[PDB]
Amino acid sequence: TMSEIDRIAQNIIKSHLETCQYTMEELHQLAWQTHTYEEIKAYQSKSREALWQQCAIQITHAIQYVVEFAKRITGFMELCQNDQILLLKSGCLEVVLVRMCRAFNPLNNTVLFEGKYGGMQMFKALGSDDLVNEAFDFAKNLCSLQLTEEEIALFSSAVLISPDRAWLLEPRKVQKLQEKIYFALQHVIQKNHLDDETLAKLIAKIPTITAVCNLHGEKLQVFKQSHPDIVNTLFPPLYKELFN
């Protein structure tokens, strides 16, 4: 029933419009804003703990918006609460990564961080260039597809509503909603990207999105070894809860 597909699509697009940390309008105005050399130096001078704490806050900030995104999606809130929790815990960062592509400049490889765009050298103090490089390469590759806001909305929702997450009690229900989302997205893609493979190319990036996020979890686990106190007493409570 196209009627249902359309309503589901509109609801997700509406939710996305109302729940990104940065609206398209704000992004357009923040377009030409890269950190100054002094600001970049400042970032590189921060301790590893200090920068990690800053990164943890920014990520948590973005994750909180993904939670709002999910709550405004009718089909999501119809899933039993247990699965809602599982989808969010396993997919919040993946959605943030997809959304991050909206705030990534593929010409000079810079990402919006704390109000301005900065290259990967901005994260030097993390001592995790492999993680950063992987995050940037994905963003750069997703940006090459030139997705519209509607496509990003629908795709980010498909990433979130994944019937493959382990421990789901009612996977089939998640699968059913995700199929309606993918079918909606496939049609939207026709409006833009003439000559595609686009949906298939997007779907093929799913495992990559997950690899970047697992790498994040790994880098974090080691950080917890070196600085346990900073994690349990300084990082945002939600960040600790989701990745510990």
Binding site: V67, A70, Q81, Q84, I85, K89, P237, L238, L242
Partner: peptide
């Protein structure tokens, strides 16, 4: 997941 649980119901 006390926190995530709280946010979902806020």
């Amino acid at each position: 997941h006390k926190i995530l649980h709280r946010l979902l119901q806020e």
